[PDB]
Design a binder for this molecule. Sequence first.
Ligand SMILES: [Mg+2]
Ligand SMILES: [Mg+2]
Ligand SMILES: [Mg+2]
Ligand SMILES: [Mg+2]
Ligand SMILES: [Mg+2]
Ligand SMILES: [Mg+2]
Ligand SMILES: [Mg+2]
Ligand SMILES: [Mg+2]
Ligand SMILES: [Mg+2]
Ligand SMILES: [Mg+2]
Ligand SMILES: [Mg+2]
Ligand SMILES: [Mg+2]
Ligand SMILES: [Mg+2]
Ligand SMILES: [Mg+2]
Ligand SMILES: [Mg+2]
Ligand SMILES: [Mg+2]
Ligand SMILES: [Mg+2]
Ligand SMILES: [Mg+2]
Ligand SMILES: [Mg+2]
Ligand SMILES: [Mg+2]
Ligand SMILES: [Mg+2]
Ligand SMILES: [Mg+2]
Ligand SMILES: [Mg+2]
Ligand SMILES: [Mg+2]
Ligand SMILES: [Mg+2]
Ligand SMILES: [Mg+2]
Ligand SMILES: [Mg+2]
Ligand SMILES: [Mg+2]
Ligand SMILES: [Mg+2]
Lengths: 129, 151, 80, 123
Amino acid sequence: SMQDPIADMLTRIRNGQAANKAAVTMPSSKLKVAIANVLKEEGFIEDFKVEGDTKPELELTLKYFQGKAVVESIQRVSRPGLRIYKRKDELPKVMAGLGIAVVSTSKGVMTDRAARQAGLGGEIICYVA
Amino acid sequence: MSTLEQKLTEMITAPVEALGFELVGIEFIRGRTSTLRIYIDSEDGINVDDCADVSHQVSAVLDVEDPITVAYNLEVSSPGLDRPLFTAEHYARFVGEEVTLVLRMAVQNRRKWQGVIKAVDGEMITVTVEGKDEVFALSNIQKANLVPHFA
Amino acid sequence: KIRTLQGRVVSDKMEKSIVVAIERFVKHPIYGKFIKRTTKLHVHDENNECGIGDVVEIRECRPLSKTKSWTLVRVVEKAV
Amino acid sequence: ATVNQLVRKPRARKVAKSNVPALEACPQKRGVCTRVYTTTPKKPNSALRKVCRVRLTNGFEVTSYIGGEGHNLQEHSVILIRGGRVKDLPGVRYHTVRGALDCSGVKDRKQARSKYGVKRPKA
RNA sequence: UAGCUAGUAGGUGGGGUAACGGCUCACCUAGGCGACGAUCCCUAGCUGGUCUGAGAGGAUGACCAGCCACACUGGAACUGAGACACGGUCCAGACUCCUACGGGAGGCAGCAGUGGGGAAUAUUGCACAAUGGGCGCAAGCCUGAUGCAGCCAUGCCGCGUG
RNA sequence: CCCGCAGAAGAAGCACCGGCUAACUCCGUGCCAGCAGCCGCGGUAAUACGGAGGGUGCAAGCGUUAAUCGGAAUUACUGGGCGUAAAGCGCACGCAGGCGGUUUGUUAAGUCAGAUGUGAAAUCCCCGGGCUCAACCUGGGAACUGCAUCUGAUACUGGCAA
RNA sequence: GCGGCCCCCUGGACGAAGACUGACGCUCAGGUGCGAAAGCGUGGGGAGCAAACAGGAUUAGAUACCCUGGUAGUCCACGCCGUAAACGAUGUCGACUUGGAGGUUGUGCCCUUGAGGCGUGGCUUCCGGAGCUAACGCGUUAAGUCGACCGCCUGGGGAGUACGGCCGCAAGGUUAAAACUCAAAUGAAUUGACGGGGGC
RNA sequence: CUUACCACUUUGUGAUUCAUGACUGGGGUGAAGGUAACCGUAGGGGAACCUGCGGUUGGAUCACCUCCU
Ligand SMILES: [Mg+2]
Ligand SMILES: [Mg+2]
Ligand SMILES: [Mg+2]
Ligand SMILES: [Mg+2]
Ligand SMILES: [Mg+2]
Ligand SMILES: [Mg+2]
Ligand SMILES: [Mg+2]
Ligand SMILES: [Mg+2]
Ligand SMILES: [Mg+2]
Ligand SMILES: [Mg+2]
Ligand SMILES: [Mg+2]
Ligand SMILES: [Mg+2]
Ligand SMILES: [Mg+2]
Ligand SMILES: [Mg+2]
Ligand SMILES: [Mg+2]
Ligand SMILES: [Mg+2]
Ligand SMILES: [Mg+2]
Ligand SMILES: [Mg+2]
Ligand SMILES: [Mg+2]
Ligand SMILES: [Mg+2]
Ligand SMILES: [Mg+2]
Ligand SMILES: [Mg+2]
Ligand SMILES: [Mg+2]
Ligand SMILES: [Mg+2]
Ligand SMILES: [Mg+2]
Ligand SMILES: [Mg+2]
Ligand SMILES: [Mg+2]
Ligand SMILES: [Mg+2]
Ligand SMILES: [Mg+2]
């Protein structure tokens, strides 16, 4: 059965923007919108929105620059199979800092660059260049 | 069966006694890497350099008279400490030395024994195994090797 | 304030004793999958009070048997 | 595969045995020759593969290749073998060391004298 | 190598110990332990570290430092703060040795050294001047610890052979 | 350690030169042999065998062997595979196990943050100091990624409740 | 694996439309169960077929090749075996991602309905896009992009062998070596010889 | 002087092994023809091969003479 929403959220983006779609939808959840907004709040996605009452639908707007997908590689690192946590000093880098890593710090889910400024360690959700 | 081994022995007897050396140890075994072993009993000393002179001499005669069903895999060989002795001349010289002898038609209490030579006969050898000197008929014995005392 | 440790009781058959399986969950040395590791700790239970399968808090004391070096401070749940 | 399998059974480090057992990790192992013999290559080539039969000190009886020429060895010679093997002849995984105390060093060698004990010519 | 276990898992009582305790007894109970690998066989002193590797790792435990165990083999205690005691005791054994043949003596895995083994590894040195340790008020005495030397291209580093 | 003395005077070798890999000719040589870590080398011409010249490499050493790691992503945690190259059980059910939708509350176990304690010295590493340099020795630090405890934080995982 | 007709017993799938419970799920070592053919046990039974066997035809020699026989077997009952190129040579579950062609079983709508037009399901076949792949190919039924879990591989031979264990009446099965041996073995495709063929 | 303990020992009784070594399971072993390949099994039997049943497509063999940027 399905055993991970985030992975399915990610691939839906990956396979989504793979098909060069405009906007891909999936059932919403806190972590997701929490995740999803950080992209836009970083510039990875155009925009997102939640639709329906008593039913969770997340519709986020992708983006293309010069006919090329704005995101190119997105890898869920912490998996339901094996969990991953990293101390603040040890928060990784993506493409020498060109990429962003989503880390669920205790205070809030946020970018690893902000987490290093906040001096806080967290579960590495996923990677994105 | 002797694969013309006596004929081969006559063919290789002329070279071995030609450079003067002394012939013992004719053997051949076909199969993967089929090979024959020829032993030179050099009293002076069986150096591979002395063997080298005999080996070129025996190969040169051998190619014209190539043996039937025998490949060109000769082993010009020093008869080691465990040299195998078949003739009564050996046991004659090998006066009081031990030897391990195995025979063709194996039977209960066959002469497969290892012991010291005490007497020598043309078709029979007396060798001390079982704690007593006993008669051995080399007629049925197809394999027998002189043994040095070791650990 | 005091070192104390909580475990579930595997067995209470022992007279005035209990067998407690305590669970500790760890990062794994090579890989990193957190796997449960359990110890069959022998524990002194006075009154033969506890019951098999109960959850219970335990503190260590001077050794008391060949295998029991721990005694129970109190029980957390009950009525298993 | 899945780590859950590895924690059930981890990656066995592929074992690898040594190619020179009669040495037992000693870089050289003396032994007494037992019978020397040359053997003939097959029909197309004529040659004298010079190898000898030697029991090691530790009872490991094996054959050792005899490199060079002018060696005066024969049965009971007490020589010293070392690692290395010859690709052409099977069953030979050891070669003696030229210039061993029993061995007489190859004479008339003016090059590669360290591989035969041929001392610097007095000149 | 899948079962393992009867002082065995626990309890009472006594004894026992510097002290806890099946430490041991008496009894009481019939448990405990194992696929989170018991049990068994086989291998191995362990660690700081060393080597390798970009790393993770892998291999390693020579020297120096920490810990352990062992002192002909087996067994035992005695004394003492501390020993079941390397140059202490007793018994058994093997071996070596002495003998008057009746009995005795012995323990280099201290330092040298011999034999042997082996591919292979050194001097039967000097000094207690220094640091240490013992005993002693001290003086001082003792110290194959240690300080030094000898041996060896074994290694590293340096230099020359213009 | 310094000063004096005389005089180039007492002091260079091993390996390699077909390819991999830096460095080539000449005669031998006749598959005789040799050479070999391998692929391969060798006959009338052999830059691969022997010798000479010449050259490369190192150097008081140079080689060979052993041996461990590397190269080896060749047990792939980092970091492999499984249509046909090795590799999906004949198929299913199912315990243990592993994993788990969504919302709120609680918990604080995971986790993170901090703090304290500890993590022997040496070793490593940084910054030094001392041996004429260097090795070596040494000061200080860093580091010792761990462990334990206290304080925390609550996103996630877990637990508990709905 | 399943093939006349009919009845009796019963399992599973699918659709429409709700209503219902409330994460009750997924995977599966061990574990049970099923499991082509052949074979085994006991009893059957007995047409056709047919190992073996029997005979006829035919060379050192009939042998093989062919006939003509023909037993076991093939079938039934109940046991036992548990292996097959048991293969889609592709574990199970989920989600996502261009198309065209089909078959097949539903079912909504609407033409006047048959038809026909619109739909909308399940199963299934075939091309082929991106993709991936060593290539061949695969390509919404992925060998694509992901997830969860299990099984499994580590040069070739030796060898699925030996031993041991376990199962079976056996036959055997399963579990699974090493010594030694080799510098390969292998996968796809590339170009040419086959061909002496086949056609022009 | 005696009791308990217990080294060594001895007796048998076994097992586990370690060798030596007499003996035995087995990798290599000194023509008439009809030809897709295979798998499971049975029988013929020196074995192989063929046959019996059932299943699969994986429904072809072979290959040797040089360059500097
Ligand atoms: Mg010659
Ligand atoms: Mg008591
Ligand atoms: Mg040590
Ligand atoms: Mg040492
Ligand atoms: Mg005392
Ligand atoms: Mg003492
Ligand atoms: Mg002593
Ligand atoms: Mg000594
Ligand atoms: Mg010696
Ligand atoms: Mg003294
Ligand atoms: Mg020196
Ligand atoms: Mg050379
Ligand atoms: Mg590796
Ligand atoms: Mg691979
Ligand atoms: Mg195949
Ligand atoms: Mg395969
Ligand atoms: Mg389960
Ligand atoms: Mg769970
Ligand atoms: Mg969840
Ligand atoms: Mg330190
Ligand atoms: Mg230091
Ligand atoms: Mg300085
Ligand atoms: Mg929660
Ligand atoms: Mg049948
Ligand atoms: Mg036939
Ligand atoms: Mg039947
Ligand atoms: Mg099978
Ligand atoms: Mg798939
Ligand atoms: Mg089928």
